[PDB]
Amino acid sequence: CQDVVQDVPNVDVQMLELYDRMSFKDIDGGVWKQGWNIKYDPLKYNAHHKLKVFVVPHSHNDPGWIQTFEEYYQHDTKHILSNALRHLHDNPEMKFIWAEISYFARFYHDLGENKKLQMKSIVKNGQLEFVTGGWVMPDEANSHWRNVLLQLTEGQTWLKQFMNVTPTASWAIDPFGHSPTMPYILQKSGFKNMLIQRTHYSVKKELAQQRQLEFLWRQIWDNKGDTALFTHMMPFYSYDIPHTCGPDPKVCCQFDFKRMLSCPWKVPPRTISDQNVAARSDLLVDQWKKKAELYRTNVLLIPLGDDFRFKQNTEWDVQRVNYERLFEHINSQAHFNVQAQFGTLQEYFDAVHQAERAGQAEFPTLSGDFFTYADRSDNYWSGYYTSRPYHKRMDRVLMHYVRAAEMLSAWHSWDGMARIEERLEQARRELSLFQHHDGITGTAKTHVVVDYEQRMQEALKACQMVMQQSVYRLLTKPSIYSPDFSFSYFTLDDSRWPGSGVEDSRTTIILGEDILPSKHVVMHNTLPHWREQLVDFYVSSPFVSVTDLANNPVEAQVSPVWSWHHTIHPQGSTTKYRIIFKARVPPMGLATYVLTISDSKPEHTSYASNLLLRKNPLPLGQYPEDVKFGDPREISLRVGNGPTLAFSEQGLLKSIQLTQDSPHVPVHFKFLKYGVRSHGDRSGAYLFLPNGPASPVELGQPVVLVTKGKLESSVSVGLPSVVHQTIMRGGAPEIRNLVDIGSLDNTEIVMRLETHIDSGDIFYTDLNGLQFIKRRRLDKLPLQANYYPIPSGMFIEDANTRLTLLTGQPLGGSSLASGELEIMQDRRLASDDERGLGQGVLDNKPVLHIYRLVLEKVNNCVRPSELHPAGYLTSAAHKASQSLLDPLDKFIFAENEWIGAQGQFGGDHPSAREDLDVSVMRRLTKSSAKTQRVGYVLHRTNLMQCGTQKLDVCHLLPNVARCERTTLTFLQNLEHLDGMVAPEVCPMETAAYVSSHS
Ligand SMILES: OC[C@@H]1[C@@H](O)[C@H](O)[C@@H](O)c2nc(CCCc3ccccc3)cn21
Ligand SMILES: [Zn+2]
Ligand SMILES: [Zn+2]
């Protein structure tokens, strides 16, 4: 294993380092507005050194944006694919690339066998080439690496299964900035090459000047370079035809033959004839040779396409016939020294690697990311890190439910009548669809966001049905287990989605001596280690005690059920209560507990006090402790031996103390607002264009609720637009915000932490929940350029102290000053930001955001070199993130009686090292397969050293006949394991295994 802390990689281009050196001057470069007038020596080219030009036809198909997936399919995409099948069949030299497998699968399944075989023939002869082959072309900012892998696996499994092809070249022309998470997954998925487009205009110029637009993209911690993937960055403003032939879009637009739609430079395309072909070819080859000066080989990529292009058969004809006339002329005239032809992406990369093998070029190394993206001036695309934050949170919930459902159902082979495979396939595809760069980003029209939401709701329900069937099977004696595959044996209880304040939907367990004295509940732990977590349930009485199925008492706490109403005041339930207790659940396992009613106060159940700080002072039915009242004031709570927390008069954190003999370190939560410019460019779904720094929110004298208990305590307050809550369970606290931005038009609400940590200009954000990247705040860039994706975490630190904020949802954030962290909560925007959506963001809905807040001492931790581009979490911050993203699942038994009930599953499962995760467990075979196969993805993170059994997934199921190390998609074997034992994986490595069983 490489060390990833002490060694700093030696790369030609390190993007944080380059960012420090770059001026970011926004100079008019001429016809290439954001570059310079390209010059080439024409005697560069001769019969022995010709330019080789691949013209690569394509059609950018958004799986939802202005229209829904199905709308686009019926209106556009089905015609594009019908015409591709017809035109490529009929024209053997014509080529086409396709990226979105969601659309291709939707099309292919609707064809007759003859059309299906026609399609196979134009894929096998290489006319139609799949690029990437994901379900979508995913967002790279907000997306979790697990969901990027899921949608890649879903697309590539479809291609392998139905087309017998696995792409090794990736095409990502539209995501709004690019993440090194992509090459990481792609290079561990058998890829050899990738292509990106949307990078800062200043970055394109800088790399172009050094011919560093092709580079070996390695991870920021990779010393050796084994993660390196060859990457082609396109040089110009767009993927459209005016911005892909060469530097002058007025010229390139004349070779978009569909525009004879028109050219905004006001020179239309001309039909190619014997009369003008010499002149037209001279214009075009001049553009090609200028573009070729920016790259190191004599092999040139010329994409030919745009949004939903190649829809009409007359577009196919007008593009094909005019380019054939150009190629015929150019190829036959020696003076050009060009060979031009329709090609695919793989053909381009194959030719580039031939030129490299033959010493014609060596490529530079690069580490870093391409956030935050700007397409022009100060138009930074940090808005979509936050846009439609309800659906951004829903992504993380469904992420976990798909993992839980695949893992719980993987333990057994299921009869086809259970429809397990059908529900999981639906769940994977709706979650995969939402990874789209107009899904999770929140950049689609109102009705399309509604479609994504309804699809993810159906996916959640499918997961619940699979999970409850699986739990019933795993915990019922096989001698009794006699399933009805349509029955609800359990209902799921989730206290964090949607959240009781968003939707009052949690079921109450109704107990009573006559009606039903006791209720079985079951916790699932998807993580491969022993876990204790407080869990809660709604119960109809406060007189409830908890036992395991062995009748061992379990210490519990009962709290009232509070909700908040309209200024903003709490109300207690007189009819339902929260029972809280510590579930202990095996690795990848289940634990059964029992809730029982009694006459009076149980022996092992404590009751919380309830202080309502307010100026002019509530029943709680049977709740044994009366609500106490007071005037606003400073309060201080400790739970267990964990941190002591001081809160302001207004119910917001002001200080944390770690241990009894620790200093009270200050940490001030504060809600500010950003506004929208009245003059010049407007913030919208994409762009963050603040009219200056944020100004404090008008807090007033808000009602403050303090709940104090042995196991769990809480401070809630009803601030305008936010119900803010700090929850203490005896480690790092949990923050919940119920955010209702209401009708505050042209507002972005931000949550800031003000510390005295001596961070300076340094801060750390994660990429795709996989790695933490060093950020430097740059005063030479505007505020919106210092905003980065916060997909799972952010942190600041000096020599002694670190504060880490973990998120249950991707949001935008920064450290705009020494010892600050800030993260945006919601944004309501009356204006369009001129990126084609043609609406503002006025469809806000109440969302419950969740966080863990981890103040630590790091002076005794091995931190990486001051030069290292990476950061690493501590064990505590990492476990806190795991608590947010993969909590214990809760199941309530539906019926009165459970004959066969067992207490535990997975008691014998290995409790793997804290830094290892079974990211994926998925059974790969149906019941009708002679040999059962199960795929595992294992991820080992890297935790900071500050001062467990071996997990072999090959042997997790019995009767292992074979084990393979595979690509992350499970689609190819990389290493036969003779000992059928999985070698363990290095820090910051992700590996996949497929185990066979006889
Ligand atoms: O800008 C980003 C979005 C992105 O969200 C989509 O996923 C991507 O496919 C896309 N295509 C366009 C075309 C430009 C709009 C237009 C077209 C003619 C006239 C006026 C405006 C915009 N976008
Ligand atoms: Zn797009
Ligand atoms: Zn083998």
Which fold would CATH assign to domain 609-886? Answer: Beta-galactosidase; Chain A, domain 5 (2.70.98)
Distance (Å, rounded) from C-alpha 174 to C-alpha 62? 9
Report how far ligand 2's centroid is from the alpha carbon of 231 (Å): 20
Please report which ligand is nearest the Cα atom of 65.
Answer: 1
d(CA 717, CA 498): 19
Question: Does 548 carry a binding-site annotation?
Answer: no
Q: Are 156 and 189 in contact (CB under 8 A)?
A: yes
Contacts 24+ apart (CB under 8 A), 120-124: 120/163, 121/89, 122/85, 122/88, 122/89, 123/163, 123/165
**How many other CB atoms sit within 10 Å of the CB of residue 416?**
12
CA dist., res. 684 & res. 176, Å (int): 14
**Residue 46 burial (CB < 10 Å; 0-12/13-18/19+)?**
exposed
CA of 836 to the centre of ligand 1 (A): 4
d(CA 551, CA 594): 8
The structure tokens listed for 932 are: 């059962």
Amino acid identity for residue 489 in this structure: Y
d(CA 230, CA 169): 10
* Helix (H), strand (E) at residue 293: helix 277-293
Q: Which atom of ligand 1 is nearest to the CA of 375?
A: 1
Q: Residue 526 Cα, ligand 1 centroid: separation in angstroms?
A: 40
Give the span between the Cα atoms of 932 and 925, in whole angstroms. 6
Rounded Cα distance, 227 and 771, in Å = 14
Cβ atoms of 437 and 64 closer than 8 Å: no
Tokens describing residue 442: 């929140």
Which residue carries 């050009």 as its tokens?
336
Ion ligand 3, residues whose Cβ is below 5 A away: 976
CB 682 within 8 A of CB 831: yes
As a 3-state breakdown, the chain gives helix, strand, coil percent values, each rounded to 5, of 25, 30, 45
| CA separation for the pair 719, 806 (Å, rounded) | 22
Is 437 annotated to bind a ligand? Reply is yes
**Which CATH code, of 3.60.150.10, 3.20.20.140, 2.60.40.1180, 3.30.1370.60, is assigned to 489-608+887-908?**
2.60.40.1180
Rounded to the nearest whole angstrom, what is the distance from the C-alpha of residue 62 to the centroid of ligand 2?
5
Q: What are the residues whose beta carbons fall under 8 Å from the beta carbon of 22, sequence distance 6 or more? A: 202, 203, 206
Q: What does the alpha-carbon distance between residue 249 and residue 761 come to, in Å, rounded to a whole number?
A: 39
Please identify, by atom number, the ligand 1 atom nearest to the C-alpha of residue 834: 21
* CA distances for 508 relative to 536, 561, 622, angstroms: 11, 11, 15
Residues around ion ligand 2, judged by CB within 5 A, are 62, 174
Residues with active-site annotation: 174
Collect all residues with Cβ–Cβ distance below 8 Å to 350 and sequence separation of at least 6.
none
744 alpha carbon – ligand 2 mean position (Å)? 29
* CA dist., res. 915 & res. 874, Å (int): 10
User: What residue type is assigned to position 41 of the chain?
Assistant: D
Q: Give the closest ligand to the alpha carbon of residue 977.
A: 3
**174 known ligand binder:** yes
Give the residue, out of 103, 307, 387, with the most ligand 1 atoms within 8 A of its beta carbon, to mutate for a pocket test.
307
Smallest Cα–Cα separation from 742: which of 843, 650, 647? Answer: 843
Strands 811-814 and 695-696 come out as unpaired
3-state secondary structure 709-773: CCCCEEEEEEECCEEEEEEECCCCCEEEEEECCCCCCCEEEEEEEECCCCCCCEEEEEECCCEEE
Looking at the DSSP bridge assignments, the partners of residue 519 are 595
SS3 65: coil
Which long-range CB contacts under 8 A does 351-357 form with residues at least 24 apart? 351/52, 351/54, 351/297, 351/299, 352/214, 352/230, 352/232, 352/297, 352/299, 353/192, 353/230, 355/297, 355/298, 355/299, 356/297
Atom 17 (ligand 1): residue with closest C-alpha?
836
With residue 367 as reference, give the H or E element that holds it: strand 365-367
Q: Answer whether CATH 1.10.1200.10 is correct for domain 378-488.
A: no
Residues paired with residue 964 on neighbouring β-strands, in sequence order: 976, 994
Q: Which residues surround ligand 1 with Cβ inside 6 Å? A: 60, 62, 65, 174, 307, 437-438, 443, 835-836
96 three-class SS: strand
Distance 97 CA to ligand 3 centre (A): 33
Q: How long, in residues, is the chain?
A: 998
For the beta carbon of residue 322, count every other beta carbon within 10 angstroms. Answer: 20
Rg (alpha carbons) of the chain, rounded to whole number: 30
CA distances from 569 to 395, 565, 613, 617, 701 (A): 31, 6, 11, 11, 11
**Other residues' Cβ atoms within 10 Å of the Cβ of residue 478:** 7
489-608+887-908 matches 909-998 in fold: yes
User: Which residue's CA is the closest to the ligand 1 atom numbered 10?
Assistant: 836
User: Do residues 906 and 591 lie in contact, with contact meaning Cβ atoms separated by under 8 Å?
Assistant: no
- State yes or no: 58 annotated in a binding site: no
Instruction: Return the residue whose CA atom lies nearest to atom 13 of ligand 1.
Output: 836
Structure tokens at 962: 């074979």
Helices (H) and strands (E) in the chain, counts: 16, 50
Q: How many CB atoms lie within 10 A of CB 161?
A: 10
Rounded to the nearest 5 degrees, what angle is found at the Cα of 676, between the Cα atoms of 202 and 651? 110
Contact (Cβ atoms closer than 8 angstroms) between residue 252 and residue 243:
yes
Which residue is it, tokens 């989605």? 497
d(CA 14, CA 864): 16
Contact 665, 656 (CB under 8 A): yes
The strand pair at 544-548 and 553-554 is best described as antiparallel
Q: What is d(CA 743, CA 747) in angstroms, rounded to the nearest whole number?
A: 9
Query: What is the CATH code of the structural domain delimited by 1-377?
Result: 3.20.110.10
- The residues spanned by each domain of the chain are 1-377, 378-488, 489-608+887-908, 609-886, 909-998
The residues facing 520 across adjacent strands are 594
Note the ligand closest to the C-alpha atom of 383: 1
Please tell me the distance from the alpha carbon of residue 991 to that of residue 984, in angstroms, as a whole number: 9
Resolution of this deposited model, Å: 1.9
Q: What is the DSSP letter of 551?
A: -
Kindly report the protein residue whose alpha carbon is nearest to atom 9 of ligand 1: 62
Q: Which of 62, 306, 308, 445 to mutate to test the pocket of ligand 1 (most atoms within 8 A of CB)?
A: 62
Give strand pairing partners of 221.
none
Q: Which ligand is nearest to the CA of 974?
A: 3
Q: Specify the residue with its C-alpha closest to ligand 1, atom 5.
A: 438
Q: Which residues contact 906 (CB under 8 A, 6 or more apart)?
A: 525, 586, 587, 588, 589, 590
Q: 3-state DSSP call for residue 676?
A: strand
Question: Domain 909-998 has what CATH class?
Answer: mainly beta
